[PDB]
Write a protein that binds this ligand. Sequence first.
Ligand SMILES: COC(=O)c1cc(S(N)(=O)=O)c(SC2CCCCC2)cc1Cl
Ligand SMILES: COC(=O)c1cc(S(N)(=O)=O)c(SC2CCCCC2)cc1Cl
Ligand SMILES: [Zn+2]
Ligand SMILES: [Zn+2]
Lengths: 251, 251
Amino acid sequence: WRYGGDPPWPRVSPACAGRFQSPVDIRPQLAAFSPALRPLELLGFQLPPLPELRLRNNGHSVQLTLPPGLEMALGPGREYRALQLHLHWGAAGRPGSEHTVEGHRFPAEIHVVHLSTAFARVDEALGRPGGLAVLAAFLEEGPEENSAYEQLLSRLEEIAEEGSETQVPGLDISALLPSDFSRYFQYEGSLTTPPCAQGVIWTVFQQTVMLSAKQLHTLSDTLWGPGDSRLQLNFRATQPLNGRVIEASFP
Amino acid sequence: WRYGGDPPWPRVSPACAGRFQSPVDIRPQLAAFSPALRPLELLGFQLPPLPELRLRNNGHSVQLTLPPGLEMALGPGREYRALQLHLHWGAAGRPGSEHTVEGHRFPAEIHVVHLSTAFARVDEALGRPGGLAVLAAFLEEGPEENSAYEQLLSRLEEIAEEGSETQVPGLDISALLPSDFSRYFQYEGSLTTPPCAQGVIWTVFQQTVMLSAKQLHTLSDTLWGPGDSRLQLNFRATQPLNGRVIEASFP
Ligand SMILES: COC(=O)c1cc(S(N)(=O)=O)c(SC2CCCCC2)cc1Cl
Ligand SMILES: COC(=O)c1cc(S(N)(=O)=O)c(SC2CCCCC2)cc1Cl
Ligand SMILES: [Zn+2]
Ligand SMILES: [Zn+2]
């Protein structure tokens, strides 16, 4: 499968034609305040430099494979383990976040994909309720260089080639996310890539993460994709809520 | 395992010492109002008189096998098929509901047990989040004979003996349930019988169903359990929430 160009995605996976797909346009006015939604809890995210992690240009994103041991709770009894993180970005003067807020697209978005601790394998969790959970944060232009992000953005040149990978030192994975783990939107949707399986819990942080203009440019301008062509605008079109209600952890 | 003795239930099934067990004490003023909680949808529950349904004294409860085609939705895309229903009750002048409200135990309780349609088999769904969903209603004493419950209660005498069973005409299963499908409590817990699997979504109707005194006496007084003892007080003690917030569909 390619971005914005054949193949139909439903030719690749019927699930890409489901009624309850991601990403979505978040309208904070229409979100349901749900006080049951407690602050997210992360254990094991502060990684030592060794062992190193695989950072890959899979020709769709830059993917960082996460080691065993990264535990994430959405709340009492809702336990997950981190598998990987990847990013969605645009191009020079074109934003590329997947989620939008009242129609506004942010420059980029980080996703940390997690597997429910009721499942041994991703293939058993796909399409099952709460089988996968994604933590998503918007990236916005800031005045300072983000030094958490610099550790990965500095390695992109090594993996410019489509299908290329490198080993990078472990780092504080939680430092790539906002500091506010209490304020977020939550909804049930899908993977935004084939196979677009449903039953995914999306948590979208209200607080954004700041990258320098230079970092956003390194993200959007270094990697190559399928087809002597730049890896850019790697986001799926907004999908209708189709009657789903987005919950907010805050009034 | 019998009810009200040994073997301690952990010594039958370590799962019963899980951290997120059922039933629980509902305290409506600590419940979180969650406007995302939509009215329950129950299609296919109005059964014709044939085929007949298996009704069973299994020594723990009376259990009605439900046919295929009873479809239930907790939310958009979040669908279930009914498997069976059974009851929990007390004895002469003693209540036997499983769930309590502010400490109050009701005369009896009906459980309608469903399988998520993301799972082909019950055994795949046990322990998976949202794999099983139970609809629970409290049975309270009313002036009138409940004609929906009379179809089952009139048949208890035929199956009075542990392990005996009978065939009963199709009935409207939805007629055993309260009037307002928009008003309920919901939390995630467990089976209240071994193997005490967690990941069960419990939906407890705010409104109660009314049975006559005669009918409740028939329920608690007709059936024989393990050994030569009466099948009575077939409810599990209430369990700690351990941080779980009970949600409410109504303010
Ligand atoms: C540009 O989009 C992506 O490259 C991408 C985006 C996602 S997402 N946005 O989280 O759905 C996943 S997640 C999924 C892929 C299939 C197997 C489990 C992990 C994997 C990937 Cl590879
Ligand atoms: C007195 O309790 C019961 O008789 C009972 C109570 C339940 S409950 N309250 O729904 O957990 C189930 S459900 C379950 C048991 C075996 C696995 C699938 C269905 C089955 C039964 Cl048989
Ligand atoms: Zn993604
Ligand atoms: Zn039960």
